[PDB]
mmCIF file of C-alpha atoms and ligand atoms in Angstrom:
data_model
loop_
_atom_site.group_PDB
_atom_site.id
_atom_site.type_symbol
_atom_site.label_atom_id
_atom_site.label_comp_id
_atom_site.label_asym_id
_atom_site.label_seq_id
_atom_site.Cartn_x
_atom_site.Cartn_y
_atom_site.Cartn_z
ATOM 1 C CA UNK A 1 -12.198 -32.063 -27.277
ATOM 2 C CA UNK A 2 -11.861 -29.534 -24.625
ATOM 3 C CA UNK A 3 -8.369 -29.116 -22.856
ATOM 4 C CA UNK A 4 -6.849 -27.299 -20.056
ATOM 5 C CA UNK A 5 -3.171 -26.733 -19.685
ATOM 6 C CA UNK A 6 -2.449 -25.918 -16.003
ATOM 7 C CA UNK A 7 0.503 -25.162 -13.799
ATOM 8 C CA UNK A 8 2.002 -22.407 -11.589
ATOM 9 C CA UNK A 9 3.482 -18.828 -12.883
ATOM 10 C CA UNK A 10 6.302 -19.414 -14.965
ATOM 11 C CA UNK A 11 5.813 -23.081 -15.407
ATOM 12 C CA UNK A 12 5.641 -22.127 -19.263
ATOM 13 C CA UNK A 13 2.329 -23.043 -20.198
ATOM 14 C CA UNK A 14 1.870 -20.993 -23.135
ATOM 15 C CA UNK A 15 4.827 -22.593 -24.718
ATOM 16 C CA UNK A 16 2.876 -26.182 -24.354
ATOM 17 C CA UNK A 17 -0.532 -24.582 -25.399
ATOM 18 C CA UNK A 18 1.622 -23.680 -28.899
ATOM 19 C CA UNK A 19 3.408 -26.867 -28.912
ATOM 20 C CA UNK A 20 0.163 -28.844 -28.485
ATOM 21 C CA UNK A 21 -1.543 -26.740 -30.808
ATOM 22 C CA UNK A 22 1.024 -27.372 -33.678
ATOM 23 C CA UNK A 23 0.800 -30.947 -32.930
ATOM 24 C CA UNK A 24 -2.834 -31.389 -33.022
ATOM 25 C CA UNK A 25 -2.896 -29.209 -36.430
ATOM 26 C CA UNK A 26 0.249 -31.532 -37.969
ATOM 27 C CA UNK A 27 -2.120 -34.797 -36.825
ATOM 28 C CA UNK A 28 -5.206 -32.797 -39.156
ATOM 29 C CA UNK A 29 -6.859 -31.074 -36.355
ATOM 30 C CA UNK A 30 -8.238 -27.877 -35.862
ATOM 31 C CA UNK A 31 -7.486 -25.985 -32.808
ATOM 32 C CA UNK A 32 -8.325 -22.461 -31.064
ATOM 33 C CA UNK A 33 -7.223 -21.587 -27.706
ATOM 34 C CA UNK A 34 -8.084 -18.929 -25.001
ATOM 35 C CA UNK A 35 -6.161 -17.870 -21.964
ATOM 36 C CA UNK A 36 -7.343 -17.014 -18.495
ATOM 37 C CA UNK A 37 -7.766 -14.854 -16.361
ATOM 38 C CA UNK A 38 -8.596 -12.517 -19.393
ATOM 39 C CA UNK A 39 -6.906 -9.136 -18.523
ATOM 40 C CA UNK A 40 -7.710 -6.276 -20.620
ATOM 41 C CA UNK A 41 -11.104 -7.867 -21.079
ATOM 42 C CA UNK A 42 -12.988 -8.639 -18.168
ATOM 43 C CA UNK A 43 -13.148 -6.076 -15.246
ATOM 44 C CA UNK A 44 -13.518 -9.014 -13.019
ATOM 45 C CA UNK A 45 -10.149 -10.496 -13.855
ATOM 46 C CA UNK A 46 -8.851 -6.816 -13.986
ATOM 47 C CA UNK A 47 -10.188 -5.728 -10.573
ATOM 48 C CA UNK A 48 -8.634 -9.399 -9.078
ATOM 49 C CA UNK A 49 -5.010 -8.715 -10.514
ATOM 50 C CA UNK A 50 -5.728 -4.755 -9.283
ATOM 51 C CA UNK A 51 -6.041 -6.295 -6.043
ATOM 52 C CA UNK A 52 -2.945 -8.341 -5.590
ATOM 53 C CA UNK A 53 -1.217 -5.057 -6.193
ATOM 54 C CA UNK A 54 -2.597 -3.328 -3.155
ATOM 55 C CA UNK A 55 -5.959 -1.782 -4.800
ATOM 56 C CA UNK A 56 -9.566 -2.127 -3.402
ATOM 57 C CA UNK A 57 -8.992 -1.832 -0.185
ATOM 58 C CA UNK A 58 -9.033 -5.259 2.011
ATOM 59 C CA UNK A 59 -10.355 -7.423 -1.091
ATOM 60 C CA UNK A 60 -7.066 -9.638 -1.423
ATOM 61 C CA UNK A 61 -7.471 -10.697 1.813
ATOM 62 C CA UNK A 62 -10.467 -13.103 0.967
ATOM 63 C CA UNK A 63 -9.431 -15.920 -0.692
ATOM 64 C CA UNK A 64 -12.892 -16.692 -1.838
ATOM 65 C CA UNK A 65 -13.669 -13.129 -2.999
ATOM 66 C CA UNK A 66 -10.501 -13.546 -5.426
ATOM 67 C CA UNK A 67 -11.653 -17.193 -5.990
ATOM 68 C CA UNK A 68 -14.807 -15.722 -7.306
ATOM 69 C CA UNK A 69 -13.696 -12.848 -9.104
ATOM 70 C CA UNK A 70 -11.893 -14.884 -11.283
ATOM 71 C CA UNK A 71 -14.931 -17.606 -11.699
ATOM 72 C CA UNK A 72 -16.883 -14.229 -12.976
ATOM 73 C CA UNK A 73 -14.220 -13.694 -15.466
ATOM 74 C CA UNK A 74 -14.563 -17.624 -16.785
ATOM 75 C CA UNK A 75 -18.491 -17.521 -16.690
ATOM 76 C CA UNK A 76 -18.780 -14.323 -18.707
ATOM 77 C CA UNK A 77 -16.436 -16.566 -21.471
ATOM 78 C CA UNK A 78 -18.822 -19.970 -21.000
ATOM 79 C CA UNK A 79 -20.581 -19.004 -24.703
ATOM 80 C CA UNK A 80 -17.429 -18.263 -26.207
ATOM 81 C CA UNK A 81 -16.088 -21.663 -24.865
ATOM 82 C CA UNK A 82 -18.893 -23.280 -25.772
ATOM 83 C CA UNK A 83 -18.725 -21.881 -29.413
ATOM 84 C CA UNK A 84 -15.212 -22.722 -29.964
ATOM 85 C CA UNK A 85 -16.063 -26.411 -28.876
ATOM 86 C CA UNK A 86 -18.734 -26.477 -31.868
ATOM 87 C CA UNK A 87 -16.258 -24.641 -34.275
ATOM 88 C CA UNK A 88 -13.171 -26.526 -33.863
ATOM 89 C CA UNK A 89 -12.209 -30.287 -32.965
ATOM 90 C CA UNK A 90 -9.530 -29.297 -30.299
ATOM 91 C CA UNK A 91 -9.922 -26.147 -27.750
ATOM 92 C CA UNK A 92 -7.216 -25.617 -25.576
ATOM 93 C CA UNK A 93 -7.379 -23.431 -22.408
ATOM 94 C CA UNK A 94 -4.379 -21.835 -20.865
ATOM 95 C CA UNK A 95 -5.489 -21.879 -17.219
ATOM 96 C CA UNK A 96 -8.976 -22.779 -16.390
ATOM 97 C CA UNK A 97 -11.053 -23.932 -13.351
ATOM 98 C CA UNK A 98 -8.439 -26.222 -11.874
ATOM 99 C CA UNK A 99 -6.383 -23.012 -11.341
ATOM 100 C CA UNK A 100 -8.966 -21.759 -8.848
ATOM 101 C CA UNK A 101 -9.331 -24.772 -7.042
ATOM 102 C CA UNK A 102 -5.123 -25.343 -6.636
ATOM 103 C CA UNK A 103 -4.474 -21.519 -5.872
ATOM 104 C CA UNK A 104 -7.434 -21.188 -3.160
ATOM 105 C CA UNK A 105 -6.720 -24.536 -1.549
ATOM 106 C CA UNK A 106 -2.967 -23.583 -1.221
ATOM 107 C CA UNK A 107 -4.000 -20.289 0.185
ATOM 108 C CA UNK A 108 -6.037 -21.863 2.662
ATOM 109 C CA UNK A 109 -3.626 -24.511 3.427
ATOM 110 C CA UNK A 110 -6.450 -26.989 2.444
ATOM 111 C CA UNK A 111 -5.804 -30.304 0.531
ATOM 112 C CA UNK A 112 -7.733 -31.599 -2.841
ATOM 113 C CA UNK A 113 -10.216 -33.105 -1.209
ATOM 114 C CA UNK A 114 -11.224 -30.072 1.390
ATOM 115 C CA UNK A 115 -14.067 -27.520 0.998
ATOM 116 C CA UNK A 116 -12.335 -24.838 -1.303
ATOM 117 C CA UNK A 117 -11.720 -27.174 -4.154
ATOM 118 C CA UNK A 118 -15.354 -28.584 -4.023
ATOM 119 C CA UNK A 119 -16.505 -25.149 -3.800
ATOM 120 C CA UNK A 120 -14.806 -23.936 -6.856
ATOM 121 C CA UNK A 121 -16.599 -27.185 -8.581
ATOM 122 C CA UNK A 122 -20.021 -25.998 -7.433
ATOM 123 C CA UNK A 123 -19.788 -22.710 -8.323
ATOM 124 C CA UNK A 124 -18.090 -22.834 -11.527
ATOM 125 C CA UNK A 125 -19.487 -26.136 -13.300
ATOM 126 C CA UNK A 126 -22.609 -27.010 -11.648
ATOM 127 C CA UNK A 127 -23.962 -23.029 -10.935
ATOM 128 C CA UNK A 128 -22.265 -21.110 -13.568
ATOM 129 C CA UNK A 129 -22.660 -23.906 -16.088
ATOM 130 C CA UNK A 130 -18.941 -24.145 -17.196
ATOM 131 C CA UNK A 131 -18.180 -26.759 -19.217
ATOM 132 C CA UNK A 132 -15.964 -29.749 -17.871
ATOM 133 C CA UNK A 133 -12.840 -30.149 -19.641
ATOM 134 C CA UNK A 134 -12.215 -33.738 -20.898
ATOM 135 C CA UNK A 135 -8.708 -33.473 -20.098
ATOM 136 C CA UNK A 136 -6.519 -31.323 -17.596
ATOM 137 C CA UNK A 137 -2.662 -31.210 -18.415
ATOM 138 C CA UNK A 138 -0.351 -30.305 -15.546
ATOM 139 C CA UNK A 139 2.774 -28.781 -16.352
ATOM 140 C CA UNK A 140 4.855 -29.674 -13.544
ATOM 141 C CA UNK A 141 8.407 -28.245 -13.427
ATOM 142 C CA UNK A 142 10.867 -27.876 -10.867
ATOM 143 C CA UNK A 143 11.491 -24.146 -10.952
ATOM 144 C CA UNK A 144 9.153 -21.679 -12.413
ATOM 145 C CA UNK A 145 5.249 -15.379 -3.675
ATOM 146 C CA UNK A 146 7.400 -18.495 -3.421
ATOM 147 C CA UNK A 147 5.627 -20.068 -0.488
ATOM 148 C CA UNK A 148 2.321 -20.359 -2.175
ATOM 149 C CA UNK A 149 3.741 -21.198 -5.785
ATOM 150 C CA UNK A 150 5.441 -24.331 -4.415
ATOM 151 C CA UNK A 151 2.499 -25.199 -2.347
ATOM 152 C CA UNK A 152 -0.315 -24.529 -5.374
ATOM 153 C CA UNK A 153 2.475 -26.938 -7.532
ATOM 154 C CA UNK A 154 1.756 -29.275 -5.057
ATOM 155 C CA UNK A 155 -2.147 -29.143 -4.656
ATOM 156 C CA UNK A 156 -1.934 -28.989 -8.546
ATOM 157 C CA UNK A 157 -0.389 -32.570 -8.540
ATOM 158 C CA UNK A 158 -3.159 -33.915 -6.203
ATOM 159 C CA UNK A 159 -6.038 -32.700 -8.205
ATOM 160 C CA UNK A 160 -4.360 -34.606 -10.934
ATOM 161 C CA UNK A 161 -3.936 -37.544 -8.755
ATOM 162 C CA UNK A 162 -7.758 -37.415 -7.559
ATOM 163 C CA UNK A 163 -8.811 -36.963 -11.197
ATOM 164 C CA UNK A 164 -10.674 -33.533 -9.863
ATOM 165 C CA UNK A 165 -13.497 -32.734 -12.298
ATOM 166 C CA UNK A 166 -12.252 -35.137 -14.802
ATOM 167 C CA UNK A 167 -9.215 -36.967 -16.404
ATOM 168 C CA UNK A 168 -5.684 -35.473 -16.065
ATOM 169 C CA UNK A 169 -2.099 -35.971 -17.215
ATOM 170 C CA UNK A 170 0.933 -34.694 -15.511
ATOM 171 C CA UNK A 171 4.122 -33.698 -17.764
ATOM 172 C CA UNK A 172 7.088 -32.076 -17.358
ATOM 173 C CA UNK A 173 9.050 -29.381 -19.492
ATOM 174 C CA UNK A 174 10.482 -31.614 -22.063
ATOM 175 C CA UNK A 175 7.433 -33.580 -22.895
ATOM 176 C CA UNK A 176 6.961 -34.689 -26.664
ATOM 177 C CA UNK A 177 4.023 -32.862 -27.931
ATOM 178 C CA UNK A 178 3.318 -35.218 -30.704
ATOM 179 C CA UNK A 179 3.298 -38.206 -28.355
ATOM 180 C CA UNK A 180 0.844 -35.792 -25.820
ATOM 181 C CA UNK A 181 -1.234 -35.023 -28.779
ATOM 182 C CA UNK A 182 -1.823 -38.877 -29.514
ATOM 183 C CA UNK A 183 -2.639 -39.702 -25.912
ATOM 184 C CA UNK A 184 -5.134 -36.739 -25.596
ATOM 185 C CA UNK A 185 -6.871 -37.455 -29.088
ATOM 186 C CA UNK A 186 -9.829 -39.383 -29.111
HETATM 187 C C1 H6D B 1 -4.622 -15.601 -12.346
HETATM 188 S S1 H6D B 1 -4.018 -17.271 -11.794
HETATM 189 O O1 H6D B 1 -3.426 -17.118 -11.168
HETATM 190 C C2 H6D B 1 -5.796 -17.732 -11.087
HETATM 191 C C3 H6D B 1 -5.778 -17.248 -9.436
HETATM 192 C C4 H6D B 1 -6.678 -17.885 -9.141
HETATM 193 C C5 H6D B 1 -6.877 -17.566 -7.292
HETATM 194 C C6 H6D B 1 -7.684 -17.844 -6.421
HETATM 195 C C7 H6D B 1 -7.678 -17.669 -5.030
HETATM 196 C C8 H6D B 1 -6.905 -16.762 -5.206
HETATM 197 C C9 H6D B 1 -5.755 -16.431 -5.881
HETATM 198 O O2 H6D B 1 -4.805 -15.404 -5.158
HETATM 199 C C10 H6D B 1 -3.768 -15.617 -4.642
HETATM 200 F F1 H6D B 1 -3.328 -16.004 -5.659
HETATM 201 F F2 H6D B 1 -3.339 -14.725 -4.276
HETATM 202 F F3 H6D B 1 -3.624 -16.539 -3.892
HETATM 203 C C11 H6D B 1 -5.786 -16.649 -6.876
HETATM 204 N N1 H6D B 1 -7.608 -18.284 -9.694
HETATM 205 C C12 H6D B 1 -7.733 -18.457 -10.933
HETATM 206 O O3 H6D B 1 -9.278 -18.641 -11.054
HETATM 207 C C13 H6D B 1 -7.034 -18.334 -11.617
HETATM 208 C C14 H6D B 1 -6.949 -18.278 -12.854
HETATM 209 N N2 H6D B 1 -6.978 -18.356 -14.346
#
């Protein structure tokens, strides 16, 4: 089973990942995890971060340019992902494709049924061959550029509402991880 944990920066996705990992292993399931973007590994990720800190001329000004860099990062990992899906019962990704749809649409003031969200699907899942997650779990919290983080949170909820790329669940900060693991388990 492939699971992506999503949400805005500061939402506390890592803690969820760890909580879920323990709940799955308590239920007798092997678990592997990966975090995106892969800063310090993917040159594409690293240029993208660097660009948001004012490096690389006008790169940050294009949403699609940033989106593309983050896609190329995930694509470089596509074989690792598929490998972990064969090697372990449950594979949990801290951020995945939906992050690109949410930050891009937010940025462009578009909704989940808009162009950017559909572009991300075409590029990442169809063209680049990233496998679609079985579940996407939106960690949606009150308090994690504030304008964009709030709007990205909203777009994310919209992705979950439309079933973008697959089934979702939306959860809060105090979700019970054992209950969540039983819900997600085949
Ligand atoms: C690194 S996480 O915040 C992220 C952001 C964007 C993203 C997409 C478009 C524009 C963008 O720039 C900015 F955030 F400034 F809006 C970021 N795309 C991703 O795939 C991931 C991941 N993982």
